[PDB]
Design a protein around this nucleic acid. Structure first.
Ligand SMILES: [Mg+2]
Ligand SMILES: [Zn+2]
Lengths: 225, 26, 49, 726, 82, 686, 235
RNA sequence: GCGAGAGGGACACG
């Protein structure tokens, strides 16, 4: 009977991704645990993302703002890569204004206190001498994928453009087990998990949240007698 | 001569063709 | 098939349909004389013991 | 589950609108019926709740046009499913002929209690496993399930965990205490699911031989224990079968599964068969995913010896062309020679590909598991396409010589298009023709329905049932599932005037046929629908077993429509022959009693024959033994060929009352006139069955017998007597 | 042996068949009993006639025909053929 | 899509006035005559009851002045394959002798081998020494049409599945992004610029201004031209027609350059669909028998989503009692529905609508009506109008919803051309961003059609060692028995293109790469390539390119030399015991979406002639219960269900109402009566 | 975040040592993420004890049969292997079996020293005849999982002792499935259905409790990085 | 709330 409990060691490969190493897992409890954490990471790590935007010069998603090279739907698609981190659970609103020629990027937003944009270098659109963009985005906390909330579902005005929301800080999770499996039967697994997030939260926070979700979930099994 | 060359803004779509085409498509 | 010929010669013969076939009872909307439609079962009476 | 079908909520809400209206009006959710109507039309949230409440235990009929046969329409228990597609159980696909590449299906809702009872009892999918045509199962696993189960139950020698019997140094290290221990060892990377081990099973009936060897008479298996050399795949499979079924221990080819499900259908209640089929489906899918069967460029192996044999046969073709150019033969003969040598070459290439391919290859595994495809498609895929047909039907003698893996050239592809487009157009026209034939049969035989349990008529047709062999043996007649099976004996069977083997009125199933063959008797007099004496319809006993249910037919069965649909289903699937017609048109002209386009006159009297071999015409005369007259013949071109028997009709040969003098398709009218209704009935049944077996489609004869009975109801009148008759 | 059936397959049909002669008989048997049950429920408030509404423990909102078929399973009914 | 528009043109319909019809069409006129080579594609054709009758011109075919279909040919003289193109009809073609397109000329017009495959007079194919050859095909893919020329590895597919792929390439809906194919053909670009929708500069110049609506180019000499973009225009079949610029203010553009894209074009070239990661294993039976299982990413990231614009129409017309008017004032209806309507009827731009919502508030004179006698005398005293009207407004059909794009109003007051008797005519456009859902039809280019059985979450999808989930999983039993093994080769070459490659030219070059063109021994990731139709990547080249498949980011080859990969199960966690074939496949979104197919009826309009329910999805309509279905019911022996389906569900005009009331009240179903259609038959016989 | 619907846990007893646990309604797709983990922990995380090696008197090279017993060596090893034992000492304890004369021998003959116990004395092991004598020494130890027959690494440490496969785990068989309960109103919450079957040593409820304990330990190893985290809480 | 025309989907290769 191997009397050794497992541990957890972090290895910071880069800023946005890192490898955690849990060992020694019980023979056969390798791939299993890795997948049980992969699912949790890709599914239930709460985050923030833009829920609905409003542009003064348009009323729906299928038109064009004057001047801008892209069309409202292209701007929606480009504003689907905006990674944010809101603190206040309630909905918040942040504005954006640009006049004259130039490249409108994610760095030109004016988020209120608490919330912020973590990739100023993204290209949102391009304007010209006639360009004028005035867009207010709404950010709400949530988890997973929820499609756009309908205008008539709420009391939204005509100018509202609901946008489907994908709150998921994690970006890519994988794993691999290196089991010694020596002939002396003192065998064990060595789960090397690799987690990469989209700059919203470091992989430490995502894995901690997954562990919290799982510890709380399995309370029912332990909480029986 | 890989790629369809007689169009100005052609993306460089490299091709496996072994036989040259004497006649461009009409 | 051959609606004109059969219909007209039936008219001449003044022939009478008995309405007891399987396709004849489906046109007029009656229980087909087969399966659950035959009188052995259509008239079965059930009451609690 | 096999009795369930998904149903989108958007469809269930509209179908069940009045029901949900009543249910929610009862629940105060809407004050009056009009308010309920507005609520459901606007789809307020609680509606969904009530919808489920009503939809539970309420069958709905699913149908897919064309409704070729009875199983086209079946009753499923609905349930709400997200999305907008009717989720259909895979095992019913073969019944509907439904594939999921864009099909659509229609859903009807029975309303009255009679309609609901009919949907639940007569038409429920779990109650319809066997086909109504020949009794073979149609709810069995197919395609992915068959591949998964074949991978599961196959045994791979030299695999990890194998039972190695070496002793002296250490134990065998292959035995396991229970399937629990073996699955535990398989979850760890020690024991492969396809390794020869020895388990100690205690909840599975042993094979019959082991049953007699160990327990003897009445070993009650769920408690006892017995050792079994097997593979954990087979052990896991046998947990899917019912408790009492003996351990099978065989590689689960599709035919083996067919035998197993036939045994289950015959010997067990339909509910047990449905549950076993569902569990087989689940295991088959689960182990098809793990089977690792994939197709890739690397796994489509090419035969290494292609070049040498191709050069050999190209040299032979060059020689044939060379001697053609020298005038050695005409163009027809040289086309024949090229076609022959290239057919031989393609057959050889297929053989070489077959021998070169490994055993566990994905393509060879898929074809050899019975799941899909035939080896010809693999030969074309790797090997060579072979000969290709011209639009007229002749063979292009080139031929194509590049496999689809190697890639055809421009002209070879062009040649292939001929056959492809020809096949498609033929398919459409044949579909139309077979539809017409099905309509005609259904309209000529609908009024044949079972009416009496038994007419007690002593008459009955005869069945050959494994004729004698020249050396002297009982070689089983190949086509027995259609003729002898599922019929009731008209007279008892005896051997050498000994004890009775099978009494009159026996179902005559498979055990019964084995008893017959063991006793040595060959011929059996069995009742049929031809001899049934009932005034209206047919008596139940004469008809025999109902193929679907498996027991004797009911008193209300509409056997006529069942027979018509059975004969019309394999239509759209008969191919012609490359003159004696032998395709669907042959069936059409045979069931229409047409004068055959290729009549082969049969004699009308026995005795020696004066042959007069006619040139551009013919002439035959049979010396009558009544001596009445040697019925003379003429107008028969010098094309037909004397039929071959015992020997081919020879000068002075002793003919019979129906010896086909020449070759061709005899006429039912003349053979009726000359022999009688018995012989014309047997002739019609034999020809229709032969045509349907040219394509290898199995139909039980009793459907053809129903149709042929409906042919010969009427008699012509020669003398009116004195009663109103023309 | 019959594993626990569910939904529309319960009670097992093959056990019902022994309580009748043919499948068609079971159809009409159950349908007529279901009409009786629905009629009891529908007009229970007033002076119910010879309709003997449910005989086996009815479900909370068991559909009439289901109660009927279960009754037939428990040998709680009799029939006279046409 | 542009391909369908292009292919409808160039189509050759063998039926019409002065030509044979379908019933008159036999089973020999539909074949592929040997004279179709180079004049009519033998692959592309409808597969319904139109096979052979409807075809399409080959790529190089030109029509003679008299009407015959010519074909170019390279005349060979003295054994030298010159470049003197000459056009021949069928008569000249079969008069002379023609060699195959792919013959090994020795870089000077002389063949290598004596025996070359030659087409003789009467369509025969034989081998002839290189002395009698008189003509040569200009190039391979001279036989195929434009639609079929876009199928990569066509010479490995079968004629049936090639035909299906060619037919299905004309059915893809235009997506929102329209990524170009990783593996394609040289025909995409030409088939795109000739389709017409790709906006092209006629004369060179320098871009002056660019915006979503216009692209203003400055030419070399004085003249300026503002190309007007076509944004969100409804096509004839309901799809979108967006054009987006692909140039900036500083670019200079040569004459004939692709200035802007169309619906399905990506920087000039045709893009009918998207490249998704494909695995070729049978996954838990959800992808069973042509069913395909997608990943939720395709829904999350809008990989496969299309904008569909539906058009609704209503006209106010002069009625017998007066005129028809469209106003916000409407007979009794809760006021909330008027919230979306504007002051003058038609709804406001950008307003979401659903089934049963009002699009055009319309009323018509109710008819002659009777006042109560006291009301009537009081109204005669008033002189008041009846003010009756009956509300009949444009409401969307069931199962429709989405934003409102445009309201186009036509009135006689504006001096327009309207049909006589019509005062007002207003069009409303309603768009919906249809995602990909269960049952929507997806198909590659080689005839691998299939509906979407299930859309698994991203987490429970097979993922490579890198952790990238497979976007779609195709069954493996559908490949071998259809002889369409080009989907596998397309998969392999797609992986090679996505991951790039670099042939090790350290010791010369590998033998298999001897004939490989230069600047193919290396290729960066996402390096689009092209395999022409009948001259493209060989099997040996594919094996070689898979041998060198340079690692993505770390030291790791996800897909080994066999084209297969080690896949980790998404649910059980443990890897699949054997490697799986993974790659990138170009699959498309066919226009057979479920939202257009689902239908349900319980009560609707009825035919007045015979009282059967109406038919079709446009109206409510009920699914037909034909003769064959009734035969099946009779076979079962279900008399009562047949009576139900034929008597009180369809024609018992006195019975349908009773059935509705009985079900609503919960009573027993009433007994059926006699169908009205039988009474109609009786009256007609009389 | 508040789940808004707490999963429950109910059971339906099938036998004295067997159960069909139901967990419902788990989030989508929180049926497979924990079903497999619970299965693996049940199978190979609950400590137990069992035999590891055995030496039989009278047999040294002929590993097929044994004198004076109607059975053979394979039968004996099979019988001993399916024997339930509970122990507390970590080092390999040794046990003795000895029956002289004819008759039958069960699991009641093995004398357990202090600490080790047998929960099924009435289990037939073998039979003896013709004044036959059986004398067998067993080695029993505690551990986890399923250790195959350990190879005799020592050249001659145990000449008469042969190793054997060993079933340490208390739970013999676990299976699981999921469903799509309440697709519409509850948005397709999964229903995990575990079917667990265990040796007498413990009821399946106790096995699930221990599995939950070890699972919470292993998954809390991840939680002990950022305690002030955000995640799903049943509350 | 019918008719004609056109296009299109689904339909056994042993
Ligand atoms: Mg289909
Ligand atoms: Zn009879």
């Amino acid at each position: 009977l191997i009397s050794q409990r497992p541990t957890l060691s972090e290895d910071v490969l880069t800023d946005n991704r890192s490898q955690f190493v849990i060992e020694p897992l019980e023979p056969g409890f390798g791939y299993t645990l890795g997948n049980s954490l992969r699912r949790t990471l890709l599914s239930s790590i709460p985050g923030a993302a833009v829920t609905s935007i409003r542009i003064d010069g348009v009323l729906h998603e299928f038109t064009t703002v004057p001047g801008v090279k892209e069309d409202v739907t292209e701007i929606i698609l480009n504003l689907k890569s905006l990674v944010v981190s809101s603190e206040e659970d309630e909905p918040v609103t942040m504005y954006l204004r640009k006049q004259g020629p130039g490249e409108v990027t994610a760095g030109d937003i004016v988020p209120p206190a608490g919330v912020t944009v973590h990739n100023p270098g993204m290209h949102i659109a391009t304007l010209n001498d006639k360009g004028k963009l005035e867009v207010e985005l709404v950010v709400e906390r949530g988890r997973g994928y929820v499609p756009a909330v309908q205008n008539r579902a709420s009391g939204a005005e005509i100018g509202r453009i609901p946008v489907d929301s994908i709150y998921s800080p994690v970006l890519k999770v994988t794993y691999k087990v290196d089991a010694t499996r020596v002939e002396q039967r003192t065998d064990f697994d060595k789960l090397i998990l690799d987690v990469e997030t989209k700059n919203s939260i470091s992989p430490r926070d995502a894995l901690a949240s997954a562990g919290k979700t799982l510890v709380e979930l399995f309370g029912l099994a332990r909480e029986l007698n | 001569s890989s790629s369809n060359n007689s169009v100005p803004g052609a993306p460089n779509r490299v091709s496996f063709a072994k036989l040259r085409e004497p006649l461009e498509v009409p | 098939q051959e609606t004109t010929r059969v219909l007209t010669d039936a008219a001449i013969n003044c022939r009478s349909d008995k309405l007891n076939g399987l396709k004849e009872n489906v046109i007029i909307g009656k229980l087909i004389p087969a399966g659950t439609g035959i009188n052995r079962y259509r008239n079965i009476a059930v009451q609690p013991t | 589950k096999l009795h369930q079908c998904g149903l989108p909520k958007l469809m269930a809400l509209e179908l069940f609108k009045p029901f949900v209206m009543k249910r929610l009006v009862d629940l105060n959710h809407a004050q009056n019926i009009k308010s309920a109507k507005r609520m459901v039309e606007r789809q307020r949230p609680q509606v969904w709740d009530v919808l489920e409440e009503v939809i539970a235990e309420h069958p709905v009929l699913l149908n897919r046009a064309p409704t070729l046969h009875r199983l086209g329409i079946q009753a499923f228990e609905p349930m709400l499913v997200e999305g907008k597609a009717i989720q259909l159980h895979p095992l019913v696909c073969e019944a509907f002929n439904a594939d999921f590449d864009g099909d659509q299906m229609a859903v009807h809702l029975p309303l009255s209690a009679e309609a609901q009872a009919e949907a639940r009892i007569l038409m429920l999918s779990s109650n319809n496993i066997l086909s109504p045509a020949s009794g073979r199962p149609l709810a069995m696993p197919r395609l992915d399930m068959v591949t998964g189960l074949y991978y599961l139950t196959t045994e791979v020698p030299g695999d990890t965990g194998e039972y190695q019997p070496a002793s002296g140094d250490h134990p065998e290290t292959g035995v396991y205490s229970s399937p629990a221990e073996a699955i535990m060892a398989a979850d760890r990377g020690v024991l492969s699911v396809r390794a020869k081990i020895k388990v100690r099973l205690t909840q599975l009936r042993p094979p019959v031989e082991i049953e007699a060897e160990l327990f003897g008479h009445s070993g009650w298996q769920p408690g006892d224990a017995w050792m079994a050399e097997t593979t954990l795949g087979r052990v896991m499979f046998n947990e899917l079968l019912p408790l009492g079924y003996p351990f099978v221990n065989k590689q689960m080819h599709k035919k083996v599964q067919a035998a197993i499900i036939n045994d289950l259908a015959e010997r067990y209640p339909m509910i047990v068969v449905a549950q076993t089929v569902d569990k087989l489906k689940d295991a088959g899918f689960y182990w098809a995913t793990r089977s690792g069967v994939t197709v890739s460029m690397a796994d489509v192996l090419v035969p290494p010896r292609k070049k040498e044999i191709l050069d050999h046969y190209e040299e032979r073709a060059d020689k044939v062309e060379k001697q053609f150019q020298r005038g050695a033969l005409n163009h027809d003969e040289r086309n024949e020679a090229l076609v022959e040598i290239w057919k031989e070459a393609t057959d050889e290439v297929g053989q070489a590909l077959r021998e070169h391919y490994p055993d566990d290859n994905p393509i060879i595994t898929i074809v050899d598991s019975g799941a899909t495809g035939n080896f010809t498609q693999t030969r074309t895929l790797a090997g060579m396409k072979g000969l290709v047909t011209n639009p007229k039907g002749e063979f292009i003698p080139r031929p194509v010589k590049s496999s689809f893996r190697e890639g055809l050239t421009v002209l070879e592809y062009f040649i292939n298009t001929h056959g492809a487009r020809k096949g498609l157009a033929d398919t459409a026209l044949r579909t139309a023709d077979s539809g017409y034939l099905t309509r005609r049969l259904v309209d000529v035989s609908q009024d044949v329905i079972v009416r009496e349990h038994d007419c007690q008529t002593e008459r009955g047709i005869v069945v050959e049932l494994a004729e004698r062999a020249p050396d002297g043996t009982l070689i089983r007649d190949p086509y027995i599932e259609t003729s002898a099976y599922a019929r009731t004996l008209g007279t008892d069977a005896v051997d050498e005037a000994g004890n009775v083997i099978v009494e009159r009125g026996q179902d005559l199933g498979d055990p019964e046929i084995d008893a017959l063959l063991a006793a040595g008797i060959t011929q059996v007099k069995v009742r049929s629908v031809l001899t049934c004496a009932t005034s209206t319809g047919v008596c139940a006993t004469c008809y025999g077993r109902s193929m679907a249910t498996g027991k004797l037919v009911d008193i209300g069965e509409a056997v006529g429509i069942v027979a018509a649909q059975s004969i019309g289903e394999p239509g759209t699937q008969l191919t012609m022959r490359t003159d004696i017609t032998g395709g669907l048109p042959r069936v059409q002209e045979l069931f229409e009693a047409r004068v055959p386009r290729g009549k082969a006159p049969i004699a009308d009297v026995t005795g020696r024959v004066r042959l007069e071999d006619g040139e551009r015409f013919y002439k035959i005369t049979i010396v009558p033994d009544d001596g009445g007259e040697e019925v003379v013949y003429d107008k028969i071109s010098k094309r037909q060929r004397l039929r071959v028997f015992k020997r081919v009709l020879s000068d002075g040969d002793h003919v019979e009352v129906g010896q086909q003098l020449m070759e061709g398709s005899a006429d039912p009218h003349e053979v009726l006139r000359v022999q009688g209704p018995r012989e014309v009935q047997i002739h019609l049944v034999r020809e229709v069955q032969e045509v349907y077996r040219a394509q290898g489609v199995s139909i039980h004869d009793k459907h053809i017998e129903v149709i042929v009975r409906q042919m010969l109801r009427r008699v012509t009148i020669i003398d009116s007597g004195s009663t109103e008759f023309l | 042996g019959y594993d626990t059936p569910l939904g529309i397959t319960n009670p097992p049909i093959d056990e019902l068949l022994d309580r009748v002669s043919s499948k068609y008989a079971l159809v009409i048997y159950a349908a007529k009993r279901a009409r009786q049950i629905n009629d009891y429920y529908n007009q229970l408030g007033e002076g119910i006639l010879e309709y003997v509404g449910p005989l086996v423990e009815p479900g909370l909102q068991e559909k009439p025909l289901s109660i009927a078929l279960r009754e037939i399973h428990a040998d709680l009914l009799e029939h006279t053929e046409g | 899509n542009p391909l369908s528009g292009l292919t409808h043109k160039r189509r050759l319909s063998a039926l019409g006035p002065g030509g044979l019809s379908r019933e008159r069409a036999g089973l020999e006129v539909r074949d592929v005559h040997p004279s179709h080579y180079g004049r009519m594609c033998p692959i592309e054709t409808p597969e319904g009851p139109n096979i052979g009758l409807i075809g399409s011109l080959s790529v190089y075919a030109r029509v003679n002045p008299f009407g015959f279909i010519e074909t170019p040919y390279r005349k060979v003289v003295d054994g030298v394959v010159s470049d003197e193109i000459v056009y021949l009809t069928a008569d000249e073609e079969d008069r002379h002798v023609v060699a195959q397109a792919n013959s090994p000329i020795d870089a000077d017009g002389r063949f290598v081998e004596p025996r070359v495959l030659v087409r003789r007079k009467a369509g025969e194919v034989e081998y002839v020494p290189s002395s009698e050859v008189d003509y040569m095909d200009v190039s391979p893919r001279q036989m195929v049409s434009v639609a079929t020329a876009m199928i990569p590895f066509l010479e490995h597919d079968d004629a049936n599945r090639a035909l299906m792929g060619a037919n299905m390439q004309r059915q893809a809906v235009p997506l929102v992004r329209s990524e170009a194919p990783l593996v394609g053909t040289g025909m995409e670009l030409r088939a795109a610029i000739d389709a017409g929708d790709v906006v092209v500069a006629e004369e060179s110049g320098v871009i002056e201004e660019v915006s979503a609506d216009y692209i203003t180019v400055m030419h070399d000499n004085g003249t300026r031209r503002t190309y007007r973009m076509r944004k969100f225009a409804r096509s004839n079949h309901g799809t979108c027609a967006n054009q987006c610029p692909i140039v900036d203010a500083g670019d200079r553009v040569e004459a004939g350059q692709v200035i802007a894209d169309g619906p399905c074009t990506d920087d000039g070239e045709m893009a009918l669909g998207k490249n998704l990661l494909v695995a070729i294993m049978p996954w838990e039976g959800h992808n069973y028998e042509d069913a395909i299982i997608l990943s939720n990413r395709l829904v999350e990231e809008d990989v496969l989503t299309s904008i569909h614009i539906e058009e609704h129409e209503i006209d106010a017309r002069d009625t017998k009692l007066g005129a028809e008017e469209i106003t916000r004032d409407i007979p009794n209806i809760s006021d909330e529905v008027l919230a979306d309507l504007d002051e003058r009827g038609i709804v406001r731009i950008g307003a979401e609508v659903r089934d049963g919502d009002i699009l055009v508030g319309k009323v018509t004179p109710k008819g002659e009506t009777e006042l109560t006698p006291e009301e009537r005398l009081l109204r005669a005293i008033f002189g008041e109008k009846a003010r009756e009207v009956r509300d009949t407004s444009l409401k969307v059909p069931h199962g429709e919803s989405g934003k409102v794009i445009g309201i186009r109003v036509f009135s006689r007051e504006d001096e327009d051309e309207l049909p006589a008797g019509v005062n007002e005519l207003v069009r409303v456009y309603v768009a919906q961003k249809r995602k990909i859902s269960d049952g929507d039809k997806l198909a590659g280019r080689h005839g691998n059609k299939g509906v979407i059985g299930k859309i698994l979450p991203v987490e429970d999808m097979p993922f490579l060692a890198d952790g990238t989930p497979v976007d779609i999983i195709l069954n493996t039993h559908g490949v071998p028995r259809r002889m369409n093994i080009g989907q596998i080769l397309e998969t392999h070459l797609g992986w090679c293109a996505h991951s790039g490659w670099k042939v090790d030219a350290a010791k010369g070059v590998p033998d298999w790469a001897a004939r490989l063109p230069d600047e193919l021994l290396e290729a960066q990731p996402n390096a689009i390539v092209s395999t022409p139709v009948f001259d493209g990547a060989q099997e040996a080249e594919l094996q070689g390119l898979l041998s060198c498949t340079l690692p993505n980011r770390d030291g790791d080859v996800l897909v080994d030399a066999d084209g297969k990969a080690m896949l980790f199960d998404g649910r059980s966690g443990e890897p699949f015991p054997y490697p799986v074939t993974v790659g990138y496949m170009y699959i498309m979104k066919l226009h057979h979406l479920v939202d257009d197919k689902i239908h349900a009826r319980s009560t609707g309009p009825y035919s007045m002639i015979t009282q059967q329910p109406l038919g079709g999805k446009a109206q409510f309509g009920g699914q037909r219960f034909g003769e064959m279905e009734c035969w099946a019911m009779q076979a079962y022996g279900a008399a009562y269900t047949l009576q139900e389906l034929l008597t009180i569900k369809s024609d018992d005009t006195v019975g349908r109402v009773k059935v509705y009331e009985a079900i609503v009240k919960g009573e027993n179903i009433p007994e059926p009566g006699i169908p009205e259609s039988f009474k109609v038959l009786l009256k007609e016989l009389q």
